[PDB]
Amino acid sequence: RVKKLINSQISLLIGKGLHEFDSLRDPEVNDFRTKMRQFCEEAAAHRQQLGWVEWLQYSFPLQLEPSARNRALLVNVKFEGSEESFTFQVSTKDMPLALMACALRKKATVFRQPLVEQPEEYALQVNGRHEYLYGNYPLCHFQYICSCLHSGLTPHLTMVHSSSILAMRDEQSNPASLWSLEQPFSIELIEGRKVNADERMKLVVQAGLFHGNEMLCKTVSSSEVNVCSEPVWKQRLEFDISVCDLPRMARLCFALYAVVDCPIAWANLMLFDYKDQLKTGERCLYMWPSVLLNPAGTVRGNPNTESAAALVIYLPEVAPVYFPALEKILELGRHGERGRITEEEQLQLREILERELYEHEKDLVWKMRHEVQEHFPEALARLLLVTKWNKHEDVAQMLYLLCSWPELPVLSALELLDFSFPDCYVGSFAIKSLRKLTDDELFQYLLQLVQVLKYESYLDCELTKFLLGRALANRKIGHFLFWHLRSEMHVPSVALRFGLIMEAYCRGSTHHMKVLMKQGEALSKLKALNDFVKVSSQKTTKPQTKEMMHMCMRQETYMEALSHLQSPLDPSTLLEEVCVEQCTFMDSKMKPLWIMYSSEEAGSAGNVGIIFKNGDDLRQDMLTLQMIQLMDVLWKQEGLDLRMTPYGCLPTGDRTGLIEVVLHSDTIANIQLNKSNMAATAAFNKDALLNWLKSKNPGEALDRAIEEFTLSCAGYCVATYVLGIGDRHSDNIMIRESGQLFHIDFGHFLGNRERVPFILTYDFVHVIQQGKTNNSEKFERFRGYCERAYTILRRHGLLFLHLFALMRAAGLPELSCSKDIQYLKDSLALGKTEEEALKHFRVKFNEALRESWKTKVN
Numbered sequence: 071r072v073k074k075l076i077n078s079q080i081s082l083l084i085g086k087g088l089h090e091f092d093s094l095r096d097p098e099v100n101d102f103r104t105k106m107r108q109f110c111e112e113a114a115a116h117r118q119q120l121g122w123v124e125w126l127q128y129s130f131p132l133q134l135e136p137s138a139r140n141r142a143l144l145v146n147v148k149f150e151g152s153e154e155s156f157t158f159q160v161s162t163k164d165m166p167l168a169l170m171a172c173a174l175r176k177k178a179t180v181f182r183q184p185l186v187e188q189p190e191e192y193a194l195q196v197n198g199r200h201e202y203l204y205g206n207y208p209l210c211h212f213q214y215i216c217s218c219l220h221s222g223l224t225p226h227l228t229m230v231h232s233s234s235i236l237a238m239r240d241e242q243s244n245p246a247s248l249w250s251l252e253q254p255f256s257i258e259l260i261e262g263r264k265v266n267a268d269e270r271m272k273l274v275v276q277a278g279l280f281h282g283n284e285m286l287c288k289t290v291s292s293s294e295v296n297v298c299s300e301p302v303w304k305q306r307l308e309f310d311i312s313v314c315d316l317p318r319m320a321r322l323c324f325a326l327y328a329v330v331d332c333p334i335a336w337a338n339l340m341l342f343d344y345k346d347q348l349k350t351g352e353r354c355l356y357m358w359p360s361v362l363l364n365p366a367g368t369v370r371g372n373p374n375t376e377s378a379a380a381l382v383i384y385l386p387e388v389a390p391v392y393f394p395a396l397e398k399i400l401e402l403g404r405h406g407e408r409g410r411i412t413e414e415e416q417l418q419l420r421e422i423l424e425r426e427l428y429e430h431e432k433d434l435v436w437k438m439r440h441e442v443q444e445h446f447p448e449a450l451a452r453l454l455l456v457t458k459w460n461k462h463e464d465v466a467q468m469l470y471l472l473c474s475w476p477e478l479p480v481l482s483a484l485e486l487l488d489f490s491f492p493d494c495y496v497g498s499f500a501i502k503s504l505r506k507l508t509d510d511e512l513f514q515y516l517l518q519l520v521q522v523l524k525y526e527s528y529l530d531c532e533l534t535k536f537l538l539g540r541a542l543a544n545r546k547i548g549h550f551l552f553w554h555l556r557s558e559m560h561v562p563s564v565a566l567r568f569g570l571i572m573e574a575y576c577r578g579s580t581h582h583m584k585v586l587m588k589q590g591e592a593l594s595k596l597k598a599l600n601d602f603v604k605v606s607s608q609k610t611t612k613p614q615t616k617e618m619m620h621m622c623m624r625q626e627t628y629m630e631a632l633s634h635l636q637s638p639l640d641p642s643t644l645l646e647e648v649c650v651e652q653c654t655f656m657d658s659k660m661k662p663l664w665i666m667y668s669s670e671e672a673g674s675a676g677n678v679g680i681i682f683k684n685g686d687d688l689r690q691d692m693l694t695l696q697m698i699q700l701m702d703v704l705w706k707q708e709g710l711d712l713r714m715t716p717y718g719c720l721p722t723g724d725r726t727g728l729i730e731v732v733l734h735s736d737t738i739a740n741i742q743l744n745k746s747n748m749a750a751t752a753a754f755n756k757d758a759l760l761n762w763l764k765s766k767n768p769g770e771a772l773d774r775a776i777e778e779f780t781l782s783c784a785g786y787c788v789a790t791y792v793l794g795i796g797d798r799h800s801d802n803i804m805i806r807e808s809g810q811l812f813h814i815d816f817g818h819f820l821g822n823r824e825r826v827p828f829i830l831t832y833d834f835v836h837v838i839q840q841g842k843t844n845n846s847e848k849f850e851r852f853r854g855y856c857e858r859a860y861t862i863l864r865r866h867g868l869l870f871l872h873l874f875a876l877m878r879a880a881g882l883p884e885l886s887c888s889k890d891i892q893y894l895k896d897s898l899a900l901g902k903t904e905e906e907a908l909k910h911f912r913v914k915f916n917e918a919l920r921e922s923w924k925t926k927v928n
């Protein structure tokens with residue numbers, strides 16, 4: 071009775087009927103669903119018995135300042151079921167417990183009674199948010215308390231008792247031998263079906279065996295056969311590699327095309343199956359349309375069988391042959407010769423492991439494999455790349471050393487997740503080194519780890535199991551894992567994989583399924599409302615379309631679907647009462663909607679907005695914003711706060727997503743229109759930005775507003791330089807009423823292919839110099855902020871390179887080659903010393919200042 075309801079709710083949420091999984095009749099698919107349902111149900115049961123503070127860590131994980139991983143402060147505290155409140159002055163050095171004990175002493179006098187309840191029995195909720203303050207941390211270490219200190223504002227907190235937290239826990243419960251086959255590997259290319267090509271040309275089928283990116287042997291080609299719907303070959307394609315040497319993760323890649331170079335289609339398959347057995351019999355390869363051989367592409371067929379070209383191939387029977395077990399492998403690898411040559415050979419080893427290498431260096435690194443294991447364990451990735459994956463004796467010797475390799479730092483593990491390391495044991499070892507990842511680090515890299523699933527050869531994998539277990543133990547990780555997979559359900563290549571992961575997650579959290587369905591319902595109404603706006607705007611004037619939008623939002627179905635929800639941009643932010651009168655849309659092509667919200671419980675923190683966008687792909691905006699946010703995190707860990715504005719951006723479906731509204735901000739273009747009869751009207755357009763800051767920050771407040779601008783300007787000058795974000799104009803640069811500058815519209819990065827120089831804009835130099843023509847004291851403090859920021863990022867150059875390497879899996883047009891990653895290597899000057907990189911940065915900066923002065927001359 072309940073299972074039918076749950077299965078139908080899951081189908082609605084994931085945007086794919088669960089019947090379609092059963093209809094495929096695939097054992098791998100069914101075994102993933104049964105095994106992952108059990109694993110996710112175990113996590114759910116574990117959770118229901120968690121202690122009330124452990125339930126807070128699951129649902130409301132702490133939001134701390136990067137540096138946390140004296141001064142007076144006025145706090146307002148109320149109790150859960152109360153109307154009255156208490157305002158008291160505490161210190162930024164005090165912990166929540168002291169503030170809770172202070173709230174209980176203020177309440178004991180108000181209610182004339184010695185209280186039984188101790189501070190230890192409570193937690194402090196941020197008013198109107200899914201956010202809590204708890205644990206041994208001083209108040210200023212929390213992100214909510216710190217943001218309140220900058221904005222001037224007073225924190226509003228609520229004392230929630232343990233019994234009420236336990237009641238939430240309960241309300242949210244889930245309802246009640248291969249090595250003896252030395253023959254050569256070969257296949258039979260039988261025929262092709264539904265093929266479309268120019269009849270003047272001839273069809274060719276190119277095939278190659280790969281272990282990730284490297285070929286296990288040279289490619290082979292079919293005999294040229296005349297173009298037609300059903301081409302027929304019936305021929306053996308013999309590859310030079312023994313069937314016994316085929317590594318476990320070997321994949322046979324296909325490419326059909328026409329020749330006189332006209333690509334048609336590609337398809338890949340794993341030579342071994344998910345249960346480790348060698349593949350035999352006939353296989354029908356439903357091909358993917360091209361734009362030659364594509365190894366990184368999926369190893370599963372195009373689900374569109376009614377229109378896809380299908381290559382028919384035969385995998386011959388070499389004898390049921392499974393891949394040897396790890397004990398057989400470790401026995402074979404247990405025998406070898408160790409490294410034993412002079413300190414002059416070890417000097418060459420030490421030089422090449424601390425600096426792409428020549429063939430004699432590969433023979434040196436492999437010979438000294440035992441010494442790299444014990445004296446340079448972090449060089450595992452170099453050694454794995456020199457390993458001959460096309461010789462089974464060499465794979466067993468490598469796996470023997472890997473099986474007792476010490477756990478590596480997170481930075482090294484993020485490299486091992488790359489597609490250039492397709493061995494399952496290597497991936498398993500990499501995941502083992504990532505378990506020590508804090509929920510905050512995991513969240514930071516969650517987008518990349520989701521893309522790595524696209525490289526996975528099989529459905530059931532250590533990465534999937536790891537991502538699902540971290541999602542079920544932290545509701546914020548769960549929320550974003552769901553949205554990263556949900557937003558890709560319109561992509562045929564990942565819909566099966568992602569749909570199965572979301573169904574499994576849903577088995578672990580039935581309550582959270584209902585929470586996300588409530589978000590999905592709101593996004594449906596937003597698509598329909600946006601569609602109406604697009605239509606109405608091409609016929610009537612903006613005021614008339616805005617009121618028609620408001621009339622549509624005012625219907626019961628819209629008011630119910632759009633209110634009282636968790637923000638998909640941030641589960642801590644509750645979107646309560648939609649303020650229809652404040653809602654509007656922009657005039658650009660896709661007419662993005664601005665939906666305004668408010669909450670009487672939250673006060674000023676409940677006044678939030680979201681932007682629904684349908685028509686543009688938001689993946690790259692998100693990635694760029696996340697990179698900027700990573701920068702701000704890294705700068706803050708070195709004590710450098712550059713007043714960044716990392717607003718949320720989240721794709722949610724096909725060319726659909728949400729952007730977070732940053733209120734009290736306008737574009738440079740709108741400020742520079744120099745409207746008549748304003749608090750900012752100027753004698754010279756050069757003054758407009760500075761007059762606008764003066765109007766927003768009167769008297770003594772201007773000084774701090776100018777410093778906010780300088781700091782954020784320095785951060786964005788460096789961030790856009792490093793990331794090669796060009797096409798910067800006055801309409802994609804915004805400024806906050808506090809002085810903070812930020813960037814929007816990230817359609818182009820990594821120089822995509824010009825080399826984006828450092829940009830210094832005169833208008834911003836004029837604000838930095840406080841309105842003065844010459845102000846070296848203010849200008850050079852800004853060049854210092856730029857230099858500190860640049861030099862802190864270079865020290866993390868490998869973290870950006872590893873993260874961007876994992877991102878090549880996303881299929882982003884401006885992030886699909888070594889040329890794109892090369893761009894960051896140049897911008898961060900990673901091939902140089904710090905002194906040399908700083909001189910090059912100064913020369914880039916001085917060139918930007920000279921360019922800025924071509925506008926200052928006129």
Ligand SMILES: COc1ncc(C2=CCOCC2)cc1S(=O)(=O)Nc1cncc(C#CCN2CCN(C(C)C)CC2)c1
Pocket residue numbers: 654656658662664681683717729730731732733735736737801802804814815816
């Ligand atoms: C790429 O799209 C976006 N990215 C970030 C924001 C973000 C914008 C701000 O928050 C951060 C993200 C907004 C958009 S958008 O889709 O809205 N397009 C867009 C383009 N160029 C400029 C703008 C303005 C603006 C200034 N606003 C003044 C106040 N106005 C009110 C009265 C409704 C709305 C327009 C708006």
